[PDB]
């Protein structure tokens, strides 16, 4: 059962069923890859004459709408749209903002940039500028460029030690504000490289990288750098934490959990589950199931993908 024509027919049926049949809509869409869902949208329009995203908007509501509409976007469109979303307000959610931009590669970031401009008729860099300020704007602008180095074949041990010390020297030896130095090293070196930088940093600081930050820069670049480093060091662990933080406490910050599950079900969902189990003892399946209800939850559970 990947047959677009049959998928589109079953969804048309399910959408025109008196009172909609969400069970079917969810069983189909959360069990097809992003590419497969694109062929279904196509075949659905071809078949019904209306766009599928449009048909589901009318058919669906609450959190399930949000989940299903997101899934229909290609990854770049999705990211593009969640960057718009999260940078509205003064430009509010600075966490969500790194979440989306840390954790994409240079090439995903060129697509995001290109599409963003297309959907919103304005460069991503301009809204970041509008919706952020101070050093956070300088950081986000530079990340969004997606200009990290790629990879030298042998591990470039030479440059690591230099960066390690330089981060320590700018951050906490000299210390006020050679924050530019932090911005550049954190944005222009490859992830693997920076992972090693974070290990060798321990040699220079009495604290590990994360501990060293706690107390430095306060201006969001404290909290923004705690997020970026976790994200570089260990993406699965990073999303696992953010997933848990969204589901902890009375109720749920359903934006973060939805975005993550939709955005990561095809990238590293298995490692995320793995890490989540070890760090909190319970599986991701379980907190979701518990913390969500209805067709909404089984849509997440399907995107979670497995009972652990």
Q: Find where tokens 């460029």 sit.
A: 145
CATH of residue 128: 1.10.220.10
84: tokens are: 């718009």
Shared-domain flag, residues 212 and 261:
no
Q: Report CA-CA distances (Å) from 145 to 17, 112, 229.
A: 46, 10, 18
Residue 151, domain member (yes or no): no
Q: Which of 88, 120, 145 is the last residue of a domain?
A: 145
Task: Please give the tally of structural domains in the chain.
Answer: 4
CA dihedral 247, 104, 262, 89 (to 10 degrees): 60
Domain boundary among 110, 145, 180: 145
Q: What's the rounded Cα separation, in Å, for the pair 81 and 61?
A: 18
| Closest listed residue to residue 46, CA positions, set 78, 14, 7 | 7
Count of CA atoms in the C-beta half-sphere (13 A) of 98:
25
Judge whether 215 lies within some domain.
yes
Domain boundary among 92, 111, 145: 145
Domain that holds residue 298: 235-304
| C-alpha span between 147 and 251 (Å, rounded) | 39
Q: Is the domain of 241 the same as that of 277?
A: yes
Q: Which residue, chain included where needed, has tokens 């590990």?
A: 208
User: Considering the domain boundaries, does residue 261 fall inside one?
Assistant: yes
Contact 15, 8 (CB under 8 A): no
Q: What is the experimental method?
A: X-ray
- Say if 150 falls within a structural domain: no
Query: Residue 82's CB: how many other CB atoms inside 10 A?
Result: 23
What's the angle, vertex CA 108, arms to CA 103 and CA 112, rounded to 5? 105
- The vertex-266 CA angle with 262 and 270, nearest 5°, equals 100
User: In this structure, how many other beta carbons lie within 10 angstroms of the beta carbon of residue 86?
Assistant: 21
* Angle between helix 235-247 and 269-280 (nearest 10): 60
CA distance 304 to 307: 9
Q: Do 86 and 57 reside in the same domain of the chain?
A: no
User: Which are the contacts of 6, defined by CB distance < 8 A and separation ≥ 6?
Assistant: none
d(CA 113, CA 123) in angstroms, rounded, equals 7
Q: Rounded distance, CA 217 to CA 214, Å?
A: 9
For every residue of the chain, DSSP letters joined together read ---HHHHHHHHHHHHHSTT--HHHHHHHHTTS-HHHHHHHHHHHHHHHSS-HHHHHHHH--HHHHHHHHHHHS-HHHHHHHHHHHHT-SSS--HHHHHHHHTTS-HHHHHHHHHHHHHHHSS-HHHHHHHH--HHHHHHHHHHHT-------SS--HHHHHHHHHHHHHHHHTS-SS-HHHHHHHHHHS-HHHHHHHHHHHHHHSSS-HHHHHTTS--TTHHHHHHHHHHHHH-HHHHHHHHHHHHHSSSS--HHHHHHHHHHHTTTTHHHHHHHHHHHHSS-HHHHHHHH--SHHHHHHHHHH----
């Amino acid at each position: 059962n990947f047959d677009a024509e049959r998928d589109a027919l079953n969804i048309e049926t399910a959408i025109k069923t008196k009172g909609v049949d969400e069970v079917t809509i969810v069983n189909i869409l959360t069990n097809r890859s992003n590419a497969q869902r694109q062929d279904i949208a196509f075949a659905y329009q071809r078949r019904t004459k209306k766009e599928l995203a449009s048909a589901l908007k009318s058919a669906l509501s609450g959190h399930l709408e949000t989940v299903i509409l997101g899934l229909l976007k290609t990854p770049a469109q999705y990211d593009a749209s969640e960057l718009k979303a999260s940078m509205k307000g003064l430009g509010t959610d600075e966490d969500s903002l790194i979440e989306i931009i840390c954790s994409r590669t240079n090439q995903e970031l060129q697509e995001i940039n290109r599409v963003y401009k297309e959907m919103y008729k304005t460069d991503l860099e301009k809204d970041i500028i509008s919706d952020t300020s101070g050093d956070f704007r300088k950081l986000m602008v530079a990340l969004a460029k997606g200009r990290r180095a790629e990879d030298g074949s042998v591990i470039d041990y030479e440059l690591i030690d230099q960066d390690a010390r330089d981060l320590y020297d700018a951050g906490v030896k000299r210390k006020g504000t050679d924050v530019p130095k932090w911005i550049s090293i954190m944005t222009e070196r490859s992830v693997p490289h920076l992972q090693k930088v974070f290990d060798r940093y321990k040699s220079y600081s009495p604290y590990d990288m994360l501990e060293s930050i706690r107390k430095e820069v306060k201006g969001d670049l404290e909290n923004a750098f705690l997020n970026l480093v976790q994200c570089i060091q260990n993406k699965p662990l990073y999303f696992a934490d953010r997933l848990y933080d969204s589901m902890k406490g009375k109720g749920t910050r359903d934006k973060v959990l939805i975005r993550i599950m939709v955005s990561r079900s095809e990238v590293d969902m298995l490692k995320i589950r793995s890490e989540f189990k070890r760090k909190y003892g319970k599986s991701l399946y379980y907190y979701i199931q518990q913390d969500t209800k209805g067709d909404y939850q089984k849509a997440l559970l399907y995107l979670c993908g497995g009972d652990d």
